[model samples]
Each structure stands twice: as structure tokens, then as C-alpha cells.
Target: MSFETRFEKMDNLLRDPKSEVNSDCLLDGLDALVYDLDFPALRKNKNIDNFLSRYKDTINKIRDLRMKAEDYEVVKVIGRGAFGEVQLVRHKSTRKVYAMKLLSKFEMIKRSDSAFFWEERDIMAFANSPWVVQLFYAFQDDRYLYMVMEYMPGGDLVNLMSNYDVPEKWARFYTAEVVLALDAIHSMGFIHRDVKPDNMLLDKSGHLKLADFGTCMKMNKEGMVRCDTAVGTPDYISPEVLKSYGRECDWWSVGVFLYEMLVGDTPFYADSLVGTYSKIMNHKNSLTFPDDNDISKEAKNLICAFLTDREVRLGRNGVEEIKRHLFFKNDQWAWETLRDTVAPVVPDLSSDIDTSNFDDLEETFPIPKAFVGNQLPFVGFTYYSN
Candidate 1:
């Protein structure tokens, strides 16, 4: 009578063959238990053997459909990038919507230097924090890699910025939220090298969720990572990262983001890439604020502190150092309850299917004809949450 667990329920069904149960549902459960319970005791159970033999073909069919493309019906392409497009799809059985990211295997192979394929997949799959996006499944076909993840109807921070001029209080609120998110990432021994508005997605309730781990790098035991080539957005990339640095690079990006929130744009932003890099390298002189703006001195102080020498940066020691800054020390700020508080602008959605917040990526790239490249590099790319 107690069906507390799948194991018990299966045992009960086997114990009483006369008991009426949905054979399809039972088959699915057995398919899962088959791989999960790898015990000699279960293997010896005559009833399990009979059950497996009775529904072998049906179980195989259910397994085939468990984590495959056919289970999801494509609704629309929500985003497009150099490699591939992100599609908004609905699970045919659950009827729940999700964002499906399709990355071209050929493109990944060609751009192997910049493409941290496994790193991107692993972080999204294992980083168990509310601030990070949740990945449901990652599977690949002949020519592409697909990741089915939770859909964020509210779009990204860039869209939010375009719609509203952020107030100082709200900017502090968003900045504080991002600090907690970055702390979570740093705690897990990773540095989100590309921490910009475009990578920050908002949920339906307006809470920020960090996305796009394509440039994320795992730090060494001493909490440091080194790279010679500049790998992040020019406007936000830390000066130290260009030479070679560690987790501090991310804090620098956060400073740029805060400056953008308070003012209209990043501090070192210039017309050309070389000009921007020049300003970033010579930040002492290039970093300036408009006299007309009404931003608080504490905010500017924190920005300067973060944009300082990497060795003595605001968050060099840890996130705690940055959190303790005067700009974020208001009476309303509470890291634990920040998500519950109303965000500055909750995305206005007509329904769950609304894609108005997202920009139009009118064109879709055709899946290239199957490549004749060696598939060894992508051998273990397939993954499933369940």
C-alpha cells in the first residue's frame, strides 16, 4: 500500500500481478531502475526478470524517446550567434517550454581554441545555484550539439537597459544580485570571464540569472587562471586578462557593468577596439565621469576601487571585500532576500510564449551537411539531467 518510492512501487506491482497499473508508465519506471539499481540482489529477483522480458520492446521505445529531439517541438528561434541559434521549444509530453541552444559541431571544431565546449556544458549542468541557468538536457546529432535549458521569458540585462534608464537604487540592487551570482561561481572554482549585460538573463519575475558560459574558465587550486589571448568582450574585458590574470579579471568586468548602470556606458568604451584597449590599459587617465550626472560619490569610489590595480582591486581578496563597500551598504540590502524583492523592471509579458523582449534573429542557419571530421573530441558530450 505504501508507494513511497519507485523501487517499492515496482516491487508491489510485481508482487501482485492482478493489480491494474498503466503498463506504459510502469515500463518507463523499469527502464530507469534497470540502469540505476545495479545490485546483484535485484538481478536475482525472478519477478524483475519476468517483468523485463514481458515489456522489453516497450521499454526500448520509451528509452529512445526519453532524451531525444523528437520529444520537443520547436516553437521559434529566440537567439542567433556565430555558431548556431537558440530555439524556444515545448516538450511534447510535459507541454513545458524550454530554450534549446544548438551549436554547430563543425564550427566548434574549427574554433577549438575559443570553444570551451565541455566547460560550457559542465558549468550549466553542475553549477547548482539559483543565479545560474538550469540545464535539462544536452545531446548531439550528426552535425550539431543541443542543450535544452530553462526558458527565461524576461530576456537579458541588455534589453532591460535599452527599455529603462536604471536609477541608482535599482542599479545597486542589480549589482548586489550579480555580486552574489559571481560569488557562487567563484566558490565553485570557476571564473565567468565574460560577465556582461548580454550574459545576464532575467526570469519572469525579473530576478537575474547568469547565462552564456562559453568563455568561462576553471581556476587552479590557488584561485587563479592564466590566458595570453584576450577572450572577452572588449568593452568589459579586464586589462589584467590581456596580460594574464586570475579571478580578479571578473571583478573588473563587474566594475565596468556597475559604471555602465550608473552612467550610460562602460568607462573605457571607445570608437575602435584599439582605442578601447588603450583606454583600458591607461585607465587612470581614461576613466572619467560626466559632470552633469547625479551619481553618488560612494558609487564612483567603488568603481575606482574595482577598476584599480588588479593586485589591489576592490574584490581582489574576495566577494566580501566588494560587498562591504559603502555603495552597497544601504538599509534595504540583504543578500539572502534580494531575489524576493521587486526588481526595478519586471518584464512585461503577455503570456509565457511572448518573445517581444528578445530581439528578432530573423534568419536561421541550416544544419551543415554532415562533416567528415573525427568525432573523438566530442565523444562524451551527451548528457541528461534525469
Candidate 2:
């Protein structure tokens, strides 16, 4: 039987327990039947028999179907995070390429001293958005859990920040995209506790894709209540979070991100984490505006509104109030032009980095049968097509 056929049969068996047997029992029976067939083949060729032996052992505990490792060719390491290393990979059969993030179980146990592998998989499994990195498939073995996702050719916001200070107009535009992503994610009952610049990536067409869910959590019906555990990057941590606040804490972090982008430096920077945490807890000192800074007064006001501890901020008057701010007002044309253009004003760091040494880079994964949509060509162009 073909792999797909076997996979379908297994899926059906798992879905329908009334087949007079449990899913695990059926799987074991199927494996035993397949092994019997392989026994004669193994007698003719020891390598073929050995392959079956190793494959059976590898998939012994997995409920999902397994694909051959040779099907993916990992090109190079893209970036490393608290989870694990992400690599650029291509599908051997379809030639479609993507970025695959592999989270090693051993590393997670060693570092965090906890196993939340299933939680990560469950979160990604439910997250579906064009503005967010789509998790294609997740599978696990003895040592690792592999998450396949869409590849964003343009790298991430940190690359942009490191190359040059992002102007207010661009910052607002990018933040707008992030707002859409965050709104979509929140609507689905998930909170992206870590919303830093490094977690935001750009696709080939320059559209933003919110990546990373390592710190993501689901919100209960209690609404915006307090939580005690501290998480998220220091620079972007909200005052509420520092003060053991809850759901509204996300909005506070949004404020910090906007402030950092507009000012080109974190509002509460310090040489040590303790000092930064103290300043964040204090709140007022962290939100103080730099008198000599060149940013518009309106921009500073918006930042303060979102950063304040008094009220919950959202809706057209709250977050959308940023649209009428002075920094965005004067540069509306530039922002619009950038959005409609192909290449962004800045260069992508990935384009410059060499990836010739990595071995497992596959270049093939079939495009979906349906046509999605077209985007503009490279930078400095005006035409758009498929």
C-alpha cells in the first residue's frame, strides 16, 4: 500500500474507535502485519530488513505518520532562539521551500527543566493567519519535535533595527501590521506574551509575519486579570507585567514596542536586568519623555496613553488613536508609498548572509493547487502580478 493510503487508514482507525479496537492496538497490529511481509524481503536483502527494523523502532511511540527524513534538505541555520535553531529547508518532491524550526526535547529539559512540547504543538496547530507564520506540520520522535512553517525571505525586525534606526513613519506602518496580527491571535483566545521586534519577520513581498510562540498562553474567561509569573523581553515588558498584571499587560508591551521604534532606543534601558526591572515596576520614570529627542509631541503623547497604568487601552480611540499622531501625519505619503512598493527602503540581512555550507536544504514542496494571490516584484518597481 502507498504511504498516503496507509496514513488514511490509520487516521480512520484512530477517528473511529468502534472498530472493536483502540487506536494504539490497531497501530501495533498493522505494524506486525507489515513486518511479516517485510520478513521475506529482509531474507533476500539484509539492508532492506535493517531499514524496517530501524524505522519501526523510530516510530514506535508516535501516533502520527512519519515521512522520510531524506524528503527535506536543510540549507542553513537561519536563527537560534530559546526554543531551538530554525533552518531553511526545501521539499525534495515539490521543490517548494520553507523554514523549519526544530525544538530539541533534550535541550528544553536541560534549559527550562520542564517539558511543554505538547503545549507548543497545540498552540501552533490552532494558529492560522496570513499575517502570522503558518505551522504546516508538527511531528516528534525520541529526541526532537520538528515544526514546519512558511519561510519569510525578508528576515526580521531586529535586522532592520540593527541596520538603522527605523523612522517613525515606517515604525507606525510596521506596528499597524503587528496590531492586525495581535488582534487576530487574541481573537482566537491566545496571547502572544512575547511581542518583541525580533519575533516579527517580513515575507518576500515585505508583508509582516508575526513569528515565535514560545511565550504564548491562552486567556481564560476571567478577562484581564493578574498573573504572577514574569516573562517577555526586558525592554518591552509592560508595567502591569512587572507589577504582576494580567491580559491588559499585552497592551502595555505594545506601548513599549511603539515607543522603542519611534525613539530608536528602549524607554527603560539599563546596564543590568535588576535595574531595568525596578524601572519597569516604577512605571512613571520609564515612560518619561526625553526632552531633547527629535520626536513629535503627539507621538510621545500616544506612547504615554498606552503606557499609563490607569485604564485599559484598545479600540479606535485607544490603539487607533495613533493614526492621527503628528509623526504619522507628516509622513503619510512616505508610509503609503513604502507599503505599495516592492523592496523596502532597507536591505534584508539574510540576502547578505552566506548559506553555502549547510547540507540538508531541500528545494521542493508543491505549491497549493489553488492560486493564492500575487505581490509586487523586487524593490523600485510598481507592477504586481503572479
Candidate 3:
């Protein structure tokens, strides 16, 4: 048999699982092909020559290339949470600013049951739409897992509401954007359990980008997802979610979001978490509009439509059902072009890396030491943006 034919047979045997060829055997084969093969003569075959050249070139280029923490310059620590800190970073080579979320491996592993680390990365990577925050890179070191994403310098909806008085027109605009963002998420067969204003970020142009995928869950073939425990912010969570529900819960939160924007506070905002949850449970009786407010009839109608029983909810059928409501039925405000159109609260910025919209966090916690005793739990955590 020809030398090429013998090499092909060896390659196929190594690839076949049933053959029981292990890494050491495969490595030995590779060594033989590289060092013992008639390389100059093998290049005489055009196809083999082209294949070897391209494959080796790419392999050689990437052999020494590794993405590490040093690749980015930390601009500021924008956010810190239970298991992680979101750092505003600038890529050393690209000069592009990104939000680098550093998750402690120790914390994640210790709370593995509740840690949706894989799901968070999966959803962020899967959600390629303009409405969702884009993930650029996902890599892990011994100490922490890093997710580098597009920085929404405009901060989030919570900040927006705190800083600016949201007029009804602006509220209408942002509400519509939230609807679109939810649709983007749902269309991918995933439910964004957390849809509060804090999770919804604004871009430089003021368009909404849904952030935070920690609570997302994939729907089954029946177009439904279920969870034993209710997740998401207490004020905005739906009654049905406390038991178990579908995408309708997201619309409920949207209603709460719109209500907060128009009425200056969430419909069910209580002092305590238990009080807030109780109010949400009896939302039919508890939900009410401010008598003195000038919120439009259509706006009130939309909120009412969303904050209701799940069976009769506005977006229960589909996002289109909610979009067609009187509140969003504008002649000029096309849904397709709404994102590109002028936004209400355009971010004022000194530069691209500005964190003016974000609060300067006072309590600084040094990234906890790598307390994860075993690395086996964090396998297959490395990723590079395509």
C-alpha cells in the first residue's frame, strides 16, 4: 500500500472510539508523521501539501497564543455581586472597552447547585441579537471564570430611572424596546426569568440591551419552562411564577417596569421582600394606578393587559399580541426601526470608557483567593468569540 494510504488508515484508527487508541498513542502517531515521514516527497502530492501547510500554519500560530487576564486593562470595577465583579476593561490590543465579569471559581463550585454558570454563558453566547448584550469572550483561569462582553456605558434602566424623570413618551419608547428584547430572548427557546430594570442596560444611543442571564431557563418542546423556586426581583415577579409559569411572567415584569417609569415607583413596591411578594401574589387587587398621574389611557391599558392572570395575559399568545396593543400601536414608531430611531435618554459621555452613569462603588472587596480545591468541576469553560 502507498505511504499516504497507510497514514490515512492510522489517522482513522486513532479517531475511532472503539479502537481504544488513547492520547499517548495518538501523540506517538503524530510524532512519527512529523519526524519520521518523507516530508519533502509527501509535499509532491498537491492535496496533501496544501492540507499540511494550512493545518500546520494555524496550529503553529495558536500553539503559543493564550488569552489571559493581562490582555485587558481594568478601567474600573463597575459592579460587584455575590460570586463575581463586573469590571469595565479595555482590550490591550483592540483598544475596545468591554465589561469583564470575573466569577470566583470557589464561590461557583461551593454553590454549584444554584450557580447557573454554564447556562449564563450559553445564553449570552447564543443570544446574538442586537437587543441582548453581546458576549465577546469567555475564558477561565485557576482562580476565576471571565466573561468579556460589550460595555453598555449608558448603564442600566435602574440608573436611568434614578437619574432622569421618565416622561410618558420616553416610558413608551423604553417599554417597546423591552418588549423587543424579551421577544429576542423567547424566540431562542429561553425564558429570561429576571427582566427587571436592573438587568436591562442602555447603549450609548439609549437603546435597551437586555443584560444578566443568570436566571434564564430553556423552554421544552411544548413551549414552556418550569422551576420549583421563584426567581427574579421580588417587586416585578409575577404571581404565576411563584407556583410555575411560562413566558407570560416576563410580560408581567415589563408591566411593572412601565408602571415604575410612569408612576415614579413599582406598583407593588413594599418595604420588605415578604410584603412585596404578598402584593405580587394578589396583584389583581393590589395593582393600581396613581390617581394624580397624567399617564395616557393607552399606557394604563397596556400595563393592565400585562399585569393580569397568566391565561389572559397580553403576551401569553406571543410578543406580537403585546406589540399590537393600543399603547404600542403608533403610526410612526415602526417596531423594525425603533432601535435605530432617536432614543429619549441619549448618554452624555466624555469618552468611550466613561463610567459616569455607574455609581462609584465605595466598598472594595479584593477578588477572593482561588479556594476551589478541585478544578474538575470547571472543565470545558474556555471559549473565544468567533
lDDT of 3 by residue, 197-278 (tens): 8898988888888887878888998888877863545877778777556888888888889899988888988888888888
User: Is candidate 1 or 2 superior in lDDT?
Assistant: 1
Q: TM-score per candidate, in order? A: 0.79, 0.69, 0.79
**lDDT agreement with native, every candidate:** 0.77, 0.60, 0.77
Provide the lowest-lDDT 10-residue window in model 2. Answer: 375-384
Q: Arrange candidates by lDDT, descending.
A: 1, 3, 2
Query: Which 10 successive residues of model 3 have the least lDDT summed?
Result: 364-373
Error of 1 at 29 (Å): 26
lDDT of 1 by residue, 1-386 (tens): 44568778776764442333434334434554443333445546777566666767875676586477888899888898768899999999999999999887657666654357677787788888999998877775446678888999988888878877888888898889899998888888898877899899989998989988888888987887877664444788888776556788888988899899878888998888888888999998899999975989898998889888887888777777787788988777487788888887877889878988888773322432332323445545666654
For candidate 3, the lDDT comes to 0.77
Candidate 1 similarity to native, TM-score? 0.79
Model 2: per-residue lDDT, tens digit, 159-261? 6777767777677677666766777677767666657888788876777878777666767785344355645457777665666534455666677788887
Task: Extract clashing residue pairs from model 1.
Answer: none
Decoy 3 TM-score against native: 0.79
Give the poorly placed runs of model 2, Cα more than 4 Å off.
1-65, 68-70, 112-123, 224-227, 230-232, 310-386
lDDT of 3 at 59: 42
